Write a protein that binds this ligand. Structure first.
Ligand SMILES: *SCCCCCCCCCCC(=O)O
Ligand SMILES: *SCCCCCCCCCCC(=O)O
Ligand SMILES: CCCCCCCCCCOC(=O)S
Ligand SMILES: CCCCCCCCCCOC(=O)S
Lengths: 334, 332
């Protein structure tokens, strides 16, 4: 009797730019050997990390996202008024509400634009990019920001000899809009809810809030279990992502896995059967693991250093918390 | 150089089914006092009773229950679903996310998913994101579930809001339909009013100073009333417009169940048919935030007021100052 209208947008969409923010404070391996019993040698060998970035007390996941978003637009040659919507992916927004997106949009002077927060561990970016590209193609928006942002510092147990030296702070943003040629492939994603406990906050905020003066929550990590899972399962994931995009492994110029751990990633590369000269992102060396923020920060570093060029066929695999993953083939931004 | 494939899913996508979960325990107006009354609370809010989830229940647990039912009503098993989006404001864990757990609990542990946070516009956005993913080729059928557990967030001395919030979850199955079943998403926000609805103290600042006060949900009634009542009429007009439907065509208005008086003014402004049906689940459900709309859809469908395939305007509004709207067809 009646018909609901249907819309459509751009066919091809891509990473118009990347913009990275990294906090002033550089915390060395040595400067954590205080509260733990190990060396710089030890930490570096098992993780790949040399130094990491720590945000200041007044800095936040939303402030850092804003400064990243600000830089992204500059690199894309656009102002806030060109943006139709922003998606924030984070694990360290410390308010159940309000969301971060609207605050960010307002900070940048695009106060009324659409936006939500996407939470999916370190698969957030892959999912957010997916949703963005999907929204623009459907005609929901034309140009979008997607920003991985993280203030992990406050959640570290400085005595937790298993993960204290892994997490760090930062934010990086990309611009997604119409492009001459297809620049973002299909999103390949999934989960493993059974191993949800592998990466977690040990105490929920409500339990804690009812008994405040007792032990406070921290980020907890079952290393071995997350290693085995990432290293033995993401190899296939990436192949599903290349297969979807219709690309051979030997065509990937740039590998940007989530910066969880250097050993893991090394193993992922060998598995994926890439070219001997594919550029594998290793930002983790001086950035540390920045969760949902890692992939875009990885991209930015590879471009800043000139090891990757704009237009390079890249493969992104995000993996981590909740045991979730998201992957896709893209063209390098900027 | 080298091509990247351009894929495409099914063009037309709708709501196959709705499924609701509401906790056992009924908390009556009387069972909460501040300095108020049954006739006081019903006048400003439209609430009579609300439901509270038990101490062993969660956002995630209710979501699963809701999904499981949505799945039953769809005539589908968890193996038919390609992904789940959980929209919530009360999953009290920074990580891991709720979606894979719900996925695990449903018995489809492998499927994709995430948590989408956008105040009470969460559902509008999550529905949008779903249809978009299905139309794009990344999923054939999906669950969108709104879940909420606001009981522990409420401050019993807050004469402004303590009687407003409740617990509950409701999910929908989205998938290929003979005709277009989800209108174009119409959304936006007002960042400059982020504090209108907020958690007064962040979790870390609280954790670093536990001898101070604990966080609670704080609300600026007046500012939230002005905004919602006098802006969301336009949003409704923009959503009906995108859907290529006239106001006088709408069978069912389902605004977010924030406040009956807000929603009362909205209906007048929207200039719908005298016989348009208005979501009032709030009377006995209360404000369940990101879950209100699907709950209201299920309540209307259970009640007979809304039939399957009715034309329904959805308008989600709330925290962050975020809004999301669409014209959908009624499921089941
Ligand atoms: S993919 C990496 C996810 C782990 C970081 C998530 C944020 C910290 C976890 C919460 C810790 C806390 O604040 O208690
Ligand atoms: S759109 C509804 C806005 C209020 C619901 C958001 C969750 C409650 C805020 C958190 C309060 C707390 O810290 O417990
Ligand atoms: C002593 C070995 C070092 C631990 C290796 C496990 C690394 C997994 C960290 C992944 O966390 C995420 O952010 S995901
Ligand atoms: C000026 C009269 C005040 C009435 C109280 C307003 C209630 C606002 C409820 C907030 O809705 C949300 O879900 S947030």
């Amino acid at each position: 009797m009646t018909e609901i209208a249907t819309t459509s947008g751009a066919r091809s969409v891509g990473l118009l730019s990347v913009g990275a923010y990294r906090p002033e404070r550089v915390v060395t391996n040595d400067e954590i050997c205080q509260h733990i019993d190990s060396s710089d040698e030890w930490i570096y060998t098992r993780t790949g990390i040399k130094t990491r970035r720590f945000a200041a007390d007044d800095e936040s996941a939303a402030s850092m996202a804003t400064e990243a978003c600000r830089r992204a637009l500059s690199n894309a040659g656009l102002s806030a008024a060109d943006i139709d919507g922003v998606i924030v992916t984070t694990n360290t927004h410390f308010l159940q509400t309000p969301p971060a997106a609207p605050m960010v949009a307002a900070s940048l002077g695009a106060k009324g634009i659409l936006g939500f927060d996407l939470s999916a561990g370190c698969a957030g970016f892959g999912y957010a990019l997916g949703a963005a590209a999907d929204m623009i193609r459907g005609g929901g928006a034309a140009t979008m920001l997607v920003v991985g942002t993280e203030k992990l510092s406050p959640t570290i147990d400085m005595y937790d000899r298993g993960n204290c030296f892994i997490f760090a702070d930062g934010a990086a943003a990309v611009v997604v809009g119409e492009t001459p040629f297809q620049g973002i492939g299909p999103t390949v994603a999934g989960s493993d809810g059974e191993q949800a406990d592998a990466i977690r906050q040990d105490i929920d905020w409500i339990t804690f809030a009812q008994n405040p003066s007792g032990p406070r929550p921290f980020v907890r990590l079952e290393g071995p279990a997350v290693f085995r899972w990432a290293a033995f399962k993401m190899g296939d994931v990436g192949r599903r992502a290349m297969d979807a995009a219709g690309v051979r492994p030997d065509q990937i110029d740039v590998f940007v896995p989530h910066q969880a751990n250097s050993r893991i990633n090394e193993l992922l590369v060998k598995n994926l059967q890439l070219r001997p000269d594919a550029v594998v992102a290793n930002d983790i060396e001086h950035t540390g693991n920045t969760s949902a923020a890692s992939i875009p920060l990885a991209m930015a570093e590879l471009l800043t250093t000139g090891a990757a060029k704009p237009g390079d066929l890249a493969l992104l695999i995000g993996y981590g918390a909740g045991l979730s993953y998201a992957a896709q083939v893209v063209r390098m931004p900027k």
